[PDB]
Amino acid sequence: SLGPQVAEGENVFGVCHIFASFNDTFVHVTDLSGKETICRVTGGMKVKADRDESSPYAAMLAAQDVAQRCKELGITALHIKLRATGGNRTKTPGPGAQSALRALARSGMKIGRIEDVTPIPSDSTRRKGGRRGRRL
RNA sequence: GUUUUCGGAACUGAGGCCAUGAUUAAGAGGGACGGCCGGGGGCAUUCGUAUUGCGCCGCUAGAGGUGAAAUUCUUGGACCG
DSSP: OOOOOOSSSOOOEEEEEEEEOSSOEEEEEEOSSSSSEEEEEEHHHHOSOSSSTTOHHHHHHHHHHHHHHHHHHTOOEEEEEEEOSOTTTOOSOOTTHHHHHHHHHHTSOEEEEEEEOOOOOSSOSOOSSOSSOOOO
16 A cells, blocks of 8 residues: 655645534545545544434544544545535435544645535425424 | 269289488497417427435444434444435
8 A cells, every 4th residue: 555656846636525414424535536445434433422412522533533544545635525414305404514623624634625415406306294383 | 674974992014203212339248350379278299407216435433303312223234415
């Protein structure tokens, strides 16, 4: 797992798909094409209590672990690909995206272009729930 | 015992005459004509992302869900790309 390239002149790029719902966050790193992956730790991996799996703490620890693994293998520059749960459920990102991005930037890498790739439907099927909604 | 005067009513030919003869165009209505306007209607095409299932590839022990959990799917590779 070594590479005889230059390090001072330029940097090696990858992309990171940050998928964040209201109950779990994902920090997934692939190559530029996206077929081949590098590392993934989810927000339920760090905390052992499944209540706050979408906490900023678990997203911060997962982003720090992903950045440590990427520095171990040799990825320095990274393109952010932000995604919520999408569909017809909601479009607001979950409560770990900003914390994971700040932890990933503070770890000592380089950030390129931030992109929102949440699936926006053009009038898809019926949303889950009744006509009166979830009354609680 | 003629046929008139002793006269009861329908129709047509030709001319003259009438100041010869049809009130208007509703801030009523119908219709026609000209340029448009509108997720108005019917039929046949065409496009968009999303959902689900399936085929292949790569890292992988968690993923879903809740106020909190569980039923649920998972090294026979779930979730994610």
